[PDB]
Enzyme design. Structure first.
Site, PDB file in Angstrom:
ATOM      1  N   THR A 158       0.784  -1.242   0.000  1.00 58.96           N
ATOM      2  CA  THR A 158       0.000   0.000   0.000  1.00 58.96           C
ATOM      3  C   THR A 158       0.814   1.289   0.000  1.00 58.96           C
ATOM      4  O   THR A 158       1.846   1.358   0.657  1.00 58.96           O
ATOM      5  CB  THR A 158      -0.901  -0.015   1.226  1.00 58.96           C
ATOM      6  N   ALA A 171      -4.943  -6.709   5.126  1.00 57.89           N
ATOM      7  CA  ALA A 171      -6.169  -6.466   4.355  1.00 57.89           C
ATOM      8  C   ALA A 171      -7.445  -6.779   5.138  1.00 57.89           C
ATOM      9  O   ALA A 171      -8.332  -5.934   5.238  1.00 57.89           O
ATOM     10  CB  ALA A 171      -6.139  -7.235   3.059  1.00 57.89           C
TER      11      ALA A 171
HETATM   12  C1  LIG Z   1       0.377  -2.524   0.621  1.00 57.63           C
HETATM   13  C2  LIG Z   1       0.152  -3.552  -0.485  1.00 57.63           C
HETATM   14  C3  LIG Z   1       1.614  -2.968   1.393  1.00 57.63           C
HETATM   15  O1  LIG Z   1       1.398  -4.250   1.987  1.00 57.63           O
HETATM   16  C4  LIG Z   1      -0.857  -2.415   1.571  1.00 57.63           C
HETATM   17  O2  LIG Z   1      -0.391  -2.309   2.926  1.00 57.63           O
HETATM   18  C5  LIG Z   1      -1.912  -3.539   1.508  1.00 57.63           C
HETATM   19  C6  LIG Z   1      -3.188  -3.086   2.234  1.00 57.63           C
HETATM   20  C7  LIG Z   1      -4.525  -3.248   1.517  1.00 57.63           C
HETATM   21  C8  LIG Z   1      -5.668  -2.966   2.484  1.00 57.63           C
HETATM   22  C9  LIG Z   1      -4.744  -4.604   0.861  1.00 57.63           C
HETATM   23  N1  LIG Z   1      -1.594  -4.787   2.189  1.00 57.63           N
HETATM   24  C10 LIG Z   1      -1.650  -6.001   1.625  1.00 57.63           C
HETATM   25  O3  LIG Z   1      -1.924  -6.188   0.453  1.00 57.63           O
HETATM   26  C11 LIG Z   1      -1.337  -7.163   2.525  1.00 57.63           C
HETATM   27  C12 LIG Z   1       0.147  -7.211   2.832  1.00 57.63           C
HETATM   28  C13 LIG Z   1       0.355  -8.021   4.096  1.00 57.63           C
HETATM   29  S1  LIG Z   1       1.661  -7.318   4.925  1.00 57.63           S
HETATM   30  C14 LIG Z   1       1.228  -7.072   6.564  1.00 57.63           C
HETATM   31  O4  LIG Z   1       2.832  -8.225   4.809  1.00 57.63           O
HETATM   32  N2  LIG Z   1      -1.728  -8.476   2.023  1.00 57.63           N
HETATM   33  C15 LIG Z   1      -2.678  -9.221   2.596  1.00 57.63           C
HETATM   34  O5  LIG Z   1      -3.304  -8.858   3.581  1.00 57.63           O
HETATM   35  C16 LIG Z   1      -2.965 -10.574   1.992  1.00 57.63           C
HETATM   36  N3  LIG Z   1      -3.370 -11.510   3.029  1.00 57.63           N
HETATM   37  C17 LIG Z   1      -2.539 -12.084   3.894  1.00 57.63           C
HETATM   38  O6  LIG Z   1      -1.337 -11.882   3.900  1.00 57.63           O
HETATM   39  C18 LIG Z   1      -3.179 -13.016   4.898  1.00 57.63           C
HETATM   40  C19 LIG Z   1      -2.241 -14.152   5.289  1.00 57.63           C
HETATM   41  C20 LIG Z   1      -2.922 -15.090   6.278  1.00 57.63           C
HETATM   42  C21 LIG Z   1      -2.164 -16.406   6.395  1.00 57.63           C
HETATM   43  C22 LIG Z   1      -2.990 -17.427   7.145  1.00 57.63           C
HETATM   44  C23 LIG Z   1      -4.060 -10.592   0.917  1.00 57.63           C
HETATM   45  C24 LIG Z   1      -3.624 -11.460  -0.256  1.00 57.63           C
HETATM   46  C25 LIG Z   1      -4.517  -9.225   0.424  1.00 57.63           C
END
Ligand SMILES: *[C@@](C)(CO)[C@](*)(O)[C@H](CC(C)C)NC(=O)[C@H](CC[S@@](C)=O)NC(=O)[C@@H](NC(=O)CCCCC)C(C)C
Lengths: 244, 212, 244, 233, 250, 242, 241, 198
Positions: free
Chosen positions: B1, B49
């Site tokens: 993000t 997310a």
């Molecule tokens: C940028 C992409 C930088 O990460 C945003 O922060 C973004 C936020 C949005 C609201 C989607 N984050 C993002 O896509 C997540 C990055 C995780 S970071 C903390 O390393 N991705 C997710 O949340 C993914 N889900 C998981 O990682 C859950 C894993 C659970 C394992 C049991 C999704 C594929 C979106």
């Protein structure tokens, strides 16, 4: 100063628990049921009042099983009898869980006894409105018991409770004297049918249905089993043969 | 993000990318990282997310309940604190969220609150949040003036996300724009970086590092 | 169940009075009188023991005057057993306050808390109220010498002079008659003994029937000192005032 | 007499009666009439609905418990909601844990046991509702009658509610006829509507007044109201 | 199973009386006489052993009980209520004192604990007050010898001498004539026996009379030698033989 | 004494039936359902002229599409409304939609019989039933404009028109004659005003009576005093005409 | 443990325990509140039965809930402390979560909610207390005055009285308080408050106590001499007839 | 860490607190007020773990304000600092301890004396002429040992802080974005508007 019959656990001045005596009245009000102890097992029989043509035959089963070897039958408030068996069924399962062996009948009798007695100790509970006849086959033979609303129970050669308890006992005591060296499992079943028909004179305005079960070392392998078809018809015909 | 929000002469500008990642795998290029709490309240999302989506949607409900209970729209300070305090109950449990709660109320005027999963809650005029915050900060700080026009302010926000979308590997997709005023938030579109970058390059003369 | 035997201790009368609180106050109107008088340079606490015998040990006796704090003390009217229960919580409360703030508890805060406990037994729990009325004599650096009273309802008030227990109505009028704001402590001692002597249901007021205490600032020390008078000391001060 | 022994369910009368249970039975007798009847292939419920005003809706009498089981109510509806919810959960448990459609007979035993606990403990009142439970499990069509005392009877046909003695006499006379109505659901509903009208002392049965439910061999438990019941009027 | 008695069974009446406490005191009046006398170098507690049957063994039933090595108790009223109070009083002396301070509670504090237990019986849900008055005699280093009476209400009073139960009115009069501040312990036992005779209708000997003292430390009753600071219990129950000796010249 | 949840010989619960008598002592509340919307009106009934009438809140918003009018012991309604609102908002959180009026009412009624003294079955910590009846009006995509009357018995009826409170028996007779399937919203507003005017002890004006409606478009609105004054002024003219 | 239903319905539809809690309120000392254009004034009577009280330390009827809100009461004094404390805790809690002091209406709604809760919970009796809640909302200069009662009902008043002889003082205010033109000055508003208490309390400078709350946390209780002066002026108005 | 400094002079306690809020590689704010007013004459500054820091301060603030309303009275700085200590002493032995270090600056209206208390997250209280939390102390403690006099005016005390802030700016690795300075005396709490370029 009275009102001694308004609360359960209260002793009256003469030393009685009137609330239990009032429960006994609910039992006497109920359908008649019996138990015959034979030379290797026990036989249970019960009257079933047919109020309407609408009641499906052979469907409203009264005699219940605890475990695989114990049989139970009761007169009075049926829901109370069902509740008592749910307790017995939990109680036996618990015993089997810890000691591996299925519960002995004397052991099981006291389990019901302590539970029914418990319901005469507190004003916040109602005494049981049932007398329960029950028994089976264990490590050392057949056993027959009758449990009263007070929690009192004894071993019996023959037991009777409910509406036609008078006719039943009078007929049971004749069997004890006529058959001093024990009665067979087959014989006791047939004889149980007669007693139920003879006790039905007390309730002779309505039609009825016969339900019998037995537990025998040689005839049922010491397991509780209901009487069906050809054996039940044989018992029904025998009772009809000794009525005219 | 990457997400940003800043305060200026004509209200609040809010701009976000739309990329979701699972490691180096791009999970999505079309994520809504802005929650519309009410006509006068916005939430931004960065970090986990599910964590952001779930709790900010939950925040929306808490705010609606305040409306029915108090017969008045929730203040920005209060809304942010509902989330701040909830987030603090879970401190050490591993929630991951960097959030901004932007809005207008008569009492407060235009107001921005930054709330994160650590329990930090800050009021300010300029915030950039997420893996690409620094890339936005570089463009945003070096062009920010209070007396920017609504048009210029909208562009600067859009251009700041683009800057981040470009350099940050975990930012990109499209740019979602919002403008918050006395009358509430106004949506100013979804701009795909695939076409925006090349349009900005030609028109502005920037991005000379790129062959094209 | 138990619904039949519940007095309902915490209910209003049609008039809006609390039955049990009322009857508890009646109980206290039979207890030995206690008096507290606040002066400019200290406070007096005088109390009348009930139903004394010549064989009753007074040296080891302490039934009406208790030490709550190094700076707060109480006179008790009513059930001594009930009072000791509350006196103990009060002692604990003062110590909790000291452990929290490193300062001795302000008198009113200690009073409000006890009064809050008593109010509880009035509104919930279905238990009987404490059959106790307290006079509190204390000192703190905010209000100086303070005098409070609390009854079974949990209500408390502040006084310059007050009486609890038997004959309060008669005792209060005598105090209202002879009390002036600029009183020295040695004058307040006399007023307390004179008032008791007049409202006594006994023949005469004697040392073996009295508990007596003062809270006074050091005649040379410069800080607050409690004194629970010993039998011989009371006998002395009773000859001084003119009662012998 | 009755003065003293009706204070709570925990108390026995000198004759062995539980008056609190008996008064609950009275709420059923005030309730609007409903009828159950079955053949070998299908089971049917027919219910008469009650309104408050001609400006009010008619309160629903039939509740679905599962795809194969359901019931009708006479008396206190809130109690029927509490009991139907329970039976739903028990049906739900049987499917999830054992992958097994709960047998109608066992549904009755469970309702019996639930009603009992209210009749023996201090504080709690008895339930104030009667139920007619129809099902189609592994052993054909079933009909059960529930009384808040705990008693549950398996029947071919029966009725509960006000004036229900009329409908019950009709079924008792027509027993040999309707039990043979196998593979023709319509002609079993026709027999149920003829049954319920034997209990109509007051009004005529109308399109928003009548409620019907059927379960069977290839028929999942379905409710009919409004223009759906029009052909049976 | 479910205790529905969460409310008070002892409440105030319109007159101010606490019915159940008053009735408990009425039960204490019916009880057999017991007394206590405090001398300069000891304390004596005494009662009559009222036997329920000549086939019963009165030795198996002690009306006088040791609470701590230095504290003893006697009663008038209901026996069973006393027995359970003795058990609790012995326990509280450990839990609320000895386990904290490594020494036994002084007489006044153990009395205070006993009173608290009885006050609770006045106010707690679903209980009746205890039907006993106690007399507790004891010694502690900083107070010396003391004698207390504990009423069903939970109230306690220190006594030079007193009696409770049946003939308490007449016995308190008899003690008033005979008590002084210069009594030695052997004198006090002499009065104790004389006062108890006015109450006892039947046989008067060491088999029908129970008597114990709080006196000098008894090193031969300790059970072990070695620790100089441990000197032995001051509580001593007199034997049937020891009572008879003082009765031959009485 | 006698148990709280205890049946009478007639087959009714004592506490529920006595609670119904408290509601009869309440202020009048009227609901009318039309195909253009539902209208809810209440009698304020201020005990003294010094009372600030617009602080009498007997009409409350449950959600944008559901409104409520109360009659009886109105202090008892606060936790019912709180439950209702929380139910509505909660449903929207789980399902991203509006709660059905029918389901909302059912949820409110589920509370009504949760009274007793530590009973069997579940958990019912409440000393007595609610002493208040509710008129619940709203709209959903499935069943359109709806009016429900929720009672402390736990049962709820749907009504085309309903009156509750002190004037309810005379008002319901009037509502029986007046209501037809094809009424307009303005006709219904004037109708609520017409009946309230009759059953009240005081002369009806924009201070002692309150109007509200719920439509699909604007949702649930409580009319301001200047608006209601104009409808009263309009009703006076129509009655005078014939 | 103890959950006996104390507040229940009776055949005619009344909760008698709530009805009797009102009787306790009718026994309490009279309390009155009147609002002006730019102030709210709370007047309360002190009992004359015992004239040996220490006013320095004796709890007063007017309690500060927050720096901008005051609460007076009529009824059981011991009960009022419980309500006051809960209200004072909720005040600090509201400042913590909302970052803004309570509105007078909110604090009233909370206090009223507690009172109601004690009318349908097992094991508890209703509060024998009615309250007058007065003050100014944050950053607001409009005066607010509210009343609560044991049932849990609450509402706002231009002028209200509670407690003993409240029928008499309410009758006075109904023919003396003009809603069209409220009391313009603080002095003009205090005069009316003292006037109303003089209907029910016999000549007593000691007996009447007054507190004036102004906008933006400006609360001050009046001394005996100040109140005495108001009495002195009012009593000279009568003799002019 | 953040800079948290205090100095008691003749008739006032002076508190200086770091203005920066840094998380990761970004300085998120340069105008943060790391203090709460506990009562009209008592002020508390704080530094430590991200969330704990403000939550603890605001919690303590609500309790002291609640005390003031109930009692219609202001607790002495000694009483306030004992209450704070015991909360931390409680929290250090709980499931998740508050990781907050504080300074209490108060003027006792009864004693007519300024008071400064240093209390760390363990609940270690001590009264001091001057105090510091974190790494700040490693520079300022020895500096003040040299320059401090116990009878200095509030004007002298501000000069003395400027000398501490100049040293921290020269030698400490972090940009803490200057300080917000507050005076606690007999007239209450006030802020020195111009310190950044005083
Ligand atoms: C940028 C992409 C930088 O990460 C945003 O922060 C973004 C936020 C949005 C609201 C989607 N984050 C993002 O896509 C997540 C990055 C995780 S970071 C903390 O390393 N991705 C997710 O949340 C993914 N889900 C998981 O990682 C859950 C894993 C659970 C394992 C049991 C999704 C594929 C979106």
């Amino acid at each position: 100063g009275t009102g001694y019959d308004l609360s359960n656990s209260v002793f009256s001045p003469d030393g009685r628990n009137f609330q239990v005596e009032y429960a006994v009245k609910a039992v006497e009000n109920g359908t008649t049921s019996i138990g015959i102890k034979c030379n290797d097992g026990v036989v249970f029989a019960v009257e079933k009042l047919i109020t309407s043509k609408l009641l499906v035959p052979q469907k409203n089963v009264k005699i219940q099983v605890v475990d695989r070897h114990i049989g139970c039958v009761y007169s009075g408030l049926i829901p109370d009898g069902r509740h008592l068996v749910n307790r017995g069924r939990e109680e036996a399962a618990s015993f089997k869980k810890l000691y591996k062996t299925p519960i002995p009948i004397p052991a099981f009798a006291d389990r019901l006894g302590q539970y029914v007695q418990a319901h005469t100790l507190y004003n916040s509970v109602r005494p049981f409105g049932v007398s329960t006849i029950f028994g089976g086959v264990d490590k050392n033979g057949a056993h027959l018991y009758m449990l009263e609303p007070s929690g009192s129970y004894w071993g019996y050669k023959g037991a009777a409770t409910g509406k036609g308890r008078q006719s039943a006992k009078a007929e049971l005591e004749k069997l004890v004297d006529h058959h001093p060296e024990g009665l067979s499992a087959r014989e006791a079943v047939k004889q149980a049918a007669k007693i139920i028909y003879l006790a039905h004179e007390d309730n002779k305005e309505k039609d009825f249905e016969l339900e019998i079960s037995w537990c025998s070392l040689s005839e049922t392998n010491g397991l509780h089993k209901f009487v069906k078809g050809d054996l039940l018809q044989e018992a029904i015909d025998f009772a009809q043969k000794e009525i005219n | 993000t990457t997400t940003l929000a800043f305060r200026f002469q004509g209200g609040i500008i809010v701009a976000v990318d739309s990329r979701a990642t699972a490691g180096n795998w791009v999970a999505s290029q079309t994520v809504k990282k802005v929650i519309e709490i009410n006509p006068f309240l916005l939430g931004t999302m960065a970090g986990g997310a599910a964590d952001c989506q779930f709790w900010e949607t939950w925040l929306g409900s808490q705010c609606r309940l305040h409306e029915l209970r108090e017969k008045e729209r929730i203040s920005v300070a209060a809304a942010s604190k509902i989330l701040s305090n909830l987030v603090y109950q879970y401190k050490g449990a591993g929630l991951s969220m960097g959030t901004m709660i932007c809005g207008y109320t008569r009492k407060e005027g235009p107001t921005i609150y930054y709330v994160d999963s650590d329990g930090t809650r800050l009021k300010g005029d300029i915030f950039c949040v997420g893996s690409g915050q620094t890339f936005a900060y570089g463009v945003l700080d070096s062009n920010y003036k209070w007396d920017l026009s609504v048009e210029d302010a909208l562009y600067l926000g859009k251009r700041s996300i683009l800057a981040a979308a470009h350099r940050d590997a975990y930012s990109g997709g499209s740019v979602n724009l919002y403008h918050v005023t006395e009358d509430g938030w106004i949506y100013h579109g979804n701009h795909d970086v695939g076409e925006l970058f090349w349009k900005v390059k030609e028109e502005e003369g920037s991005f000379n590092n790129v062959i094209g | 169940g138990s619904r039949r035997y519940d007095s309902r201790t915490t209910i209003f009368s049609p008039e809006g009075r609390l039955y049990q609180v009322e009857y508890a106050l009646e109980s206290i109107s039979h207890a030995g009188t206690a008096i507290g008088i606040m002066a400019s340079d200290g406070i007096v606490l005088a109390a009348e023991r009930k139903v004394t015998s010549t064989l009753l040990e007074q040296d080891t006796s302490t039934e009406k005057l208790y030490k709550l704090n190094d700076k707060i003390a109480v006179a008790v009217a009513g059930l001594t057993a009930d009072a000791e229960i509350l006196i103990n919580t009060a002692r604990i409360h003062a110590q909790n306050y000291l452990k929290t703030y490193n300062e001795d508890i302000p008198v009113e805060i200690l009073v409000r808390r006890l009064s809050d406990i008593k109010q509880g037994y009035t509104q919930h729990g279905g238990l009987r109220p404490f059959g106790v009325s307290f006079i509190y004599a204390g000192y703190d650096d905010r209000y100086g010498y303070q005098l409070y009273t609390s009854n079974p309802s949990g209500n408390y008030t502040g006084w310059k002079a007050i009486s609890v227990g038997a004959n309060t109505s008669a005792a209060q009028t005598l105090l209202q008659m002879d009390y002036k704001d600029d009183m020295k402590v040695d004058d307040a001692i006399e007023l307390a003994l004179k008032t008791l002597s007049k409202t006594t249901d006994s023949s005469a007021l004697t040392y073996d029937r009295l508990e007596f205490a003062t809270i006074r600032k050091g005649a040379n020390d410069g800080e607050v000192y409690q004194k629970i008078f010993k039998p011989q000391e009371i006998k002395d001060i009773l000859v001084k005032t003119g009662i012998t | 007499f009755r003065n003293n022994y009706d204070g709570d369910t925990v108390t026995f009368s000198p004759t062995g009666r539980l008056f609190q249970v008996e008064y609950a039975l009275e709420a059923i007798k005030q309730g609007s009439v409903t009828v159950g009847l079955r053949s070998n292939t299908h089971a049917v419920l027919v219910a008469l609905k009650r309104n408050a005003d001609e400006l009010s809706s008619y309160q629903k009498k039939i509740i679905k418990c599962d795809e194969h089981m359901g019931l009708s109510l006479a008396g206190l509806a809130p109690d029927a909601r509490v009991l139907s919810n329970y039976l739903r959960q028990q049906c739900n448990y049987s499917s999830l844990v054992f992958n097994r459609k709960l047998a109608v007979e066992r549904a009755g035993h469970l309702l019996c046991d639930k009603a009992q606990k209210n009749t023996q403990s201090y504080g709690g009142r008895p339930y104030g509702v009667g139920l007619l439970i129809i099902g189609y499990d592994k052993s054909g069509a079933h009909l059960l009658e529930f009384q808040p005392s705990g008693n549950v009877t398996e029947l071919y046909g029966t009725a509960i509610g006000a004036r229900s003695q009329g409908a019950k006499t009709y079924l008792e006379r027509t027993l040999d006829t309707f039990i043979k109505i196998d593979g023709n659901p319509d002609e079993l509903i026709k027999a149920g509507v003829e049954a319920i009208s034997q209990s109509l002392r007051d009004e005529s049965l109308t399109v928003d007044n009548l409620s019907i439910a059927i379960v069977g061999k290839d028929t999942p438990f379905t409710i009919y109201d409004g223009e759906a019941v029009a052909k049976y009027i | 199973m479910t205790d529905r008695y969460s409310f008070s069974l002892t409440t105030f009446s319109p007159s101010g009386k606490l019915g159940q406490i008053d009735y408990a005191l009425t039960a204490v009046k019916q009880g057999v006489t017991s007394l206590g006398i405090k001398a300069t170098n000891g304390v004596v507690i005494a009662t009559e052993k009222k036997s329920s049957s000549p086939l019963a063994m009165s030795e198996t039933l002690s009306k006088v009980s040791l609470l701590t090595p230095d504290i003893g108790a006697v009663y008038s009223g209901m026996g069973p209520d006393y027995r359970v109070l003795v058990d609790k009083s012995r326990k509280v002396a450990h839990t609320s004192y000895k386990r904290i301070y490594g020494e036994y509670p002084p007489t006044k504090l153990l009395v205070s604990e006993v009173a608290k237990i009885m006050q609770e019986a006045t106010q707690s849900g679903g209980v009746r007050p205890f039907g006993v008055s106690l007399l507790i005699a004891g010694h502690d280093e900083f107070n010396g010898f003391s004698l207390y009476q504990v009423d069903p209400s939970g109230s306690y009073f220190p006594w030079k001498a007193t009696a409770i139960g049946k003939g308490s009115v007449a016995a308190k009069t008899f003690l008033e004539k005979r008590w002084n501040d210069e009594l030695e312990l052997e004198d006090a036992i002499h009065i104790a026996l004389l006062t108890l005779k006015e109450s006892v209708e039947g046989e008067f000997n060491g088999d029908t009379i129970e008597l114990a003292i709080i006196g000098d430390e008894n090193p031969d009753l300790l059970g072990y030698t070695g620790i100089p600071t441990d000197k032995g219990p001051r509580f001593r129950k007199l034997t049937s033989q020891e009572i008879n000796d003082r009765l031959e010249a009485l | 004494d006698r148990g709280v949840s205890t049946f009478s010989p007639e087959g009714r619960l004592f506490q529920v039936e006595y609670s119904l008598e408290a509601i009869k002592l309440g202020s009048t509340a009227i609901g009318i359902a039309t195909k253009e919307g539902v209208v809810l009106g209440v009698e304020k009934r201020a005990t003294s002229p010094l009372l600030e009438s617009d602080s009498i809140e007997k009409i409350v918003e449950i959600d944008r599409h559901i409104g409520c009018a109360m009659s009886g012991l109105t202090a008892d309604a606060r936790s019912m409304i709180e439950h209702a609102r929380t139910a509505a908002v909660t449903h929207n959180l789980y399902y991203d939609e509006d709660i059905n009026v029918e389901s909302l009412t059912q949820s409110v009624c589920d509370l009504a019989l949760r009274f007793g003294e530590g009973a069997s079955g579940e958990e019912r910590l409440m000393s007595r039933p609610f002493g208040v009846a509710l008129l619940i009006a709203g709209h959903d995509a499935d069943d359109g404009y709806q009016l429900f009357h929720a009672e402390p018995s736990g049962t709820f009826y749907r009504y085309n028109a309903k009156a509750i409170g002190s004037g309810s028996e005379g008002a319901q007779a009037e509502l029986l004659n007046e209501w037809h399937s094809s009424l307009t919203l303005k006709e219904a507003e004037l109708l609520v005003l017409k009946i309230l005017k009759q059953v009240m002890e005081e002369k009806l004006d924009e201070n002692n009576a309150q109007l509200s409606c719920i439509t699909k478009q604007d949702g649930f609105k409580i009319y301001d005093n200047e608006k209601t004054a104009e409808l009263i002024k309009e009703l006076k003219e129509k009655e005078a005409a014939e | 443990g103890y959950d006996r239903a104390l507040s229940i319905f009776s055949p005619d539809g009344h909760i008698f325990q709530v009805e009797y809690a009102l009787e306790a309120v009718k026994r309490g000392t009279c309390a009155v509140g009147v609002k002006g254009k730019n102030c709210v004034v709370l007047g309360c009577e002190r009992r004359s039965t015992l004239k040996l009280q220490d006013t320095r330390i004796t709890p007063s009827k007017v309690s500060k809930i927050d720096s901008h809100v005051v609460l007076s009461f009529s009824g059981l004094n011991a009960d009022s402390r419980i309500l006051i404390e809960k209200a004072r805790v909720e005040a600090q809690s509201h400042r913590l979560t909302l970052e803004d002091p309570v509105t007078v209406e909110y604090l009233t709604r909370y206090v009223a909610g507690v009172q109601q809760r004690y009318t349908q919970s097992g094991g508890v009796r209703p509060f024998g207390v009615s309250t007058l809640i007065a003050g100014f909302d944050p950053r607001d200069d409009e005066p607010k005055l509210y009343q609560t009662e044991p049932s849990g009902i609450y509402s706002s008043w231009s002028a209200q009285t509670i407690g003993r002889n409240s029928k008499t003082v309410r009758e006075f205010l109904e023919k003396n308080y003009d809603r069209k033109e409220p009391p313009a000055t603080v002095e003009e508003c205090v005069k009316l408050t003292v006037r109303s208490l003089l209907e029910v309390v016999q000549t007593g400078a000691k007996n009447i106590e007054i507190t004036v709350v102004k906008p933006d946390s400006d609360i001050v209780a009046l001394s005996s001499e100040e109140i005495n002066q108001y009495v002195t002026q009012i009593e000279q108005e009568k003799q002019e007839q | 860490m953040d800079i948290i400094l205090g100095i008691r002079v003749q008739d006032s306690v002076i508190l200086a607190s770091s203005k920066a809020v840094t998380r990761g590689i970004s300085v998120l704010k340069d105008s943060d007020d790391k203090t709460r007013q506990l009562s009209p004459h008592t002020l508390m500054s704080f530094a430590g773990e991200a969330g704990d820091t403000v939550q603890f301060a605001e919690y303590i603030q609500a309790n002291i304000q609640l005390y003031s309303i109930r009692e219609d009275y202001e607790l002495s700085p000694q009483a306030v600092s004992s209450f704070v200590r015991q909360e931390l002493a409680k929290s250090i032995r709980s499931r998740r301890p508050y990781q907050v270090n504080v300074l209490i600056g108060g003027y006792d209206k009864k004693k007519n004396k300024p008071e400064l208390y240093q209390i760390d997250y363990l609940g270690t209280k001590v009264e001091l002429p001057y105090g510091a939390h974190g790494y700040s102390g490693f520079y300022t403690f020895s500096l003040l040992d040299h320059h401090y006099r116990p009878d200095m005016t509030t004007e002298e005390g501000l000069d003395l802080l400027k000398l501490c802030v100049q040293e921290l700016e020269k030698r400490m690795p972090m940009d803490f974005k200057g300080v917000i300075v507050k005076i606690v005396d007999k007239d209450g709490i006030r802020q020195v508007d111009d310190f950044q370029a005083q």
